[model samples]
Target: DELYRQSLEIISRYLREQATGAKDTKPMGRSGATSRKALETLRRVGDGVQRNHETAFQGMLRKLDIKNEDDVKSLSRVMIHVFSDGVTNWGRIVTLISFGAFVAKHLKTINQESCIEPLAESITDVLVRTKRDWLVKQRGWDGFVEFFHVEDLEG
Candidate 1:
């Protein structure tokens, strides 16, 4: 569980610090712009809010008591519960990633930055592992470029 301890902390960290509504006491009301193109695009789509999801989900974010690593240990199960609730869109996928950042950010606030790494791996594990089949069907991140494409006027 060393080499394959895995990746994706950057995306979630940016998702927390950038996109989601995770400001101090989590005020992250979509202030995303990290100078990095890839993360920026992901945040752009995440902050898009699909159908005003933040208003609905905002309450849940504060109420969850995942302040310890033990609570985080079971993070994967609940996330799956949300995903399996008939969600199958790229937007919803971004929702999971965005949501992941909020909780970890919540945890880090109490001087528990150590949980950040394990917490991230669990969520991304939720992502790649949970959506492996659907992700492949969606044609990977290349599909993302088109969806969140950098629109330009060819003049």
Candidate 2:
């Protein structure tokens, strides 16, 4: 649970920095001092999932045509369910995240960079608040790291 909190803060901070163009992020909570190693590594997981599932990912983006913060939040839950489909596994979780990454890529493409932070917030909200039990049960980022350790070897 602590790992989940730290990871979410790190992710929120990462995206916030990207949107605001600053890196002077301070501690979010008591464990704000945690390294972003999981975040950096998880980014690769999202990156890889984006490519592996680009076909579906691209199609969905066009279908959704998200253009603002509300659009992101409106579809946030649906997006997670769409990609995750009620699955309780790391792959589905990564699928949900990669979808956000793909959307972030689109926002960057269309000059809607500021929307990235809201999207991150929505994702964080969904995971940390809405899906807290699942994350806690699965050991959060540590479980993710363990699940994908094989891929880490290549990079």
Candidate 3:
């Protein structure tokens, strides 16, 4: 555990830099003050990762030969929404149920680590299995609808 303890300073410093996106010139390593400072800033660490992921996804999408501004806007909205806040609960519920049914249907037949066809097949099954009533019956259906309302989206 000596290396683990010794490397704590390095890990903390890197996480701190990502969290704040600023270089910390102060000393690091087994110091109680350093750990305390790093721990305090841990909450912001996910923001750094999210920022990087959004940048990379947009960069890749821009390279693709997609046509029309509408297409770009649609793709952008989906990317931003899914990455930042995710999609609707109705979609998620349907998708999960479909994925479950697909798995159950194929559990005894497939023997592989990964299969593209089966994955696509599962998604299709989930899409086909989805029903309007399943979503309407959920307790948080109204809140799910409000998850991404227009006026509040800016905030």
Candidate 4:
């Protein structure tokens, strides 16, 4: 999970920089572009599932035995089941599906069966603490919902 940890740190630093609008002269081992692309790739996987793109999403879910959107939603839904009945739960469930799709896509390399849930939980916790409020402020709740659905965290 070293790569995951490093990736998180890189993203956290990037978000911190953006929130403060501060420039750092020191070189970064991971570029913002790389971090951005990682998130974009994750979102692409989410989109494939969202649109029910069989060829793209089916292959990604083969190992996990996820045959369709319902299956994906079911797996992701459990992650946010604690949220009360409201928009909060809905948005979180969608976000989890997006995160799960990303994990499924990386199954071969990441052995997602071993870490997907906890990893997603950790990632979500970190993002919510670091960026959620700012994002909601910058883009209203409706826009936030759209971004969450689109899985465009970097936007």
Candidate 5:
């Protein structure tokens, strides 16, 4: 989860730097910090993921137990680019909402993103529903439904 936190901070910091058009970045940590390794790795992962290449995406898909690399690549490409642009597509937002809704509706059947039926249903929600008026909201554009928290997630 530490990675998730760093990624969030990275996005927030990136937004701040871009908004100001300044080279200076607030020191998020001390030099040679152990946490920096995860940050560096996350940056590298982001770079690889942004490539929109099948291989890079397939690697992640494999971890998710996804078999259709092509589908994942397509979904991931849109998710990554839109996320990098600092705004998620309305469709993706809806997808998340739908997944959340489905989970809300079906609280007993499944409890995670791993189940195939739930996964498909949720991914459908993310890919189909649009993010209406979301970009206009400052807190709306967080990331690509992707995260890497630097601290213990349980805490």
Candidate 6:
């Protein structure tokens, strides 16, 4: 639990910094502002969390002894409860999805089949849950169905 909290703190701080910047920028186009902010946040989180050499991210990975697929998997699970309500919650969610994609690609290259599958699945579940919650809050049940193209059981 302590370790999870530590990792959560690490992620929260990163999200906070990005949200602050997003707040400073005014909309330049219909979606340009949001799009730019999302891209910047995703790019930063994707590259920033790599466990390659000396760094906070690397240290966190090492501190938790995260190397094998199983270790990484658990670490990801630990990451889910970082925060549920905040201006930056969606930012963190999308950034995490980016992280998941990044990890999936990295693991695939190295052939960590055992690791990547569940990790991606779990991350996908998180994204779906996050988006569903947001959509439901903003619109309603119909919104999710429309957004996801949900249809009758038989079609």
Q: Candidate 3: where are CA atoms >4 Å away?
A: 1-52, 69-134, 139-141, 145-155
Whichever of 4 and 5 has more lDDT, that candidate is: 4
Ranking by TM-score: 2, 1, 6, 4, 5, 3
lDDT of 2 at 77: 66
TM-score, per-candidate, Cα-based: 0.70, 0.75, 0.20, 0.28, 0.24, 0.41
Q: Model 1 off-target regions past 4 Å?
A: 1-37, 48-52, 153-155
> Per-residue lDDT for 80 in model 5?
36
Ranking by lDDT: 2, 1, 6, 4, 5, 3
lDDT of 4: 0.44
Candidate 2, residues 14-120, lDDT tens digits: the string is 55443444654454574432345556565567667778888988898998878877777787668566643565677766666667767776787778887887787
The window of 10 residues in a row where model 3 has the poorest summed lDDT is 99-108
lDDT of 6 by residue, 23-62 (tens): 3333323334334443344455445444332264434434
State each model's CA lDDT, in order. 0.60, 0.67, 0.37, 0.44, 0.37, 0.45
RMSD of each: 7.1, 3.8, 21.0, 16.3, 16.6, 15.4
* Prediction-by-prediction clash tally: 7, 0, 0, 0, 17, 0
Worst lDDT window (10 residues) for model 1?
A: 26-35
- Badly placed stretches (over 4 Å) of model 2 are 1-5, 13-35, 80-85, 151-155
Candidate 6: misplaced stretches above 4 Å?
1-54, 83-88, 105-111, 135-155
Q: Identify the runs in model 4 with alpha carbons over 4 angstroms from their true place.
A: 1-45, 48-100, 108-112, 139-141, 146-155
lDDT of 1 at 96: 75
Cα lDDT for residue 132, model 6? 54
- The sequence of per-residue lDDT tens digits that candidate 5 reaches over residues 1-155 is 33334334444333233233343335664322433443343344433333444464445435444343334335444543443345555443433323222222222233332333333333333333333344334232233222333454784
**Per-residue lDDT tens digits of candidate 1, residues 45-109?**
66565335766556776566666878778777887788756667877767776666566556667
The global Cα lDDT (0 to 1) of model 1 is 0.60
